[PDB]
Subunit: 104 residues, 2 copies
């Protein structure tokens, strides 16, 4: 997945929030990183805006099933990470915002 | 002035640096220096590498600016300038994934 624009590898949770939390960035700017402590998991980081908290980053753990697939909820699972990203770019389904822009 | 150095790419993002380095045309050890996007005062050395499992991949090493003037990536050597840092690791990888071979174009 190294070659996917949205994959930032092993940046920490804090570093993903420093990258994402920028006022030039739209709601739904996102990146995927390898989870910092859970081994074999990915994490989807999405900026979001709430009146109160202002801009903040939500983090959703992505698990990989034994057969290979990926999921965030029981609603949909994906044969690959790129399919998950493609799906959520069009359908938020429970995430805070549709994935609009890859982290610059 | 570091602004006009050919291997200095200023404020480009971590993501744009990889888009530049991760390209078939570039030898292992193609590099660029840039500012850290979020560590103030630090710089960053981005280097292309090739691992059969990863494929072509970029490694990023932070460069800290000593208060007293220098620059360093490890406790083994410190340098007075970024120029001198690039030159040294062009000869000796000394912990880096690869010697700095090619300035990124």
């Amino acid at each position: 997945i190294q070659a996917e624009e949205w994959y930032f590898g092993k940046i920490t949770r804090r570093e993903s929030e420093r990258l994402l939390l920028n006022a030039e960035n739209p709601r739904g700017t996102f990146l995927v990183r390898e989870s910092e402590t859970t081994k074999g998991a990915y994490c989807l980081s999405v900026s979001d805006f709430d009146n109160a908290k202002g801009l903040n980053v939500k983090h959703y753990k992505i698990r990989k099933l034994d057969s290979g697939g990926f999921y965030i909820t029981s609603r949909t699972q994906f044969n690959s990470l790129q399919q998950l990203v493609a799906y959520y770019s069009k359908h938020a389904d429970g995430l805070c915002h549709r994935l609009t822009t890859v982290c610059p």
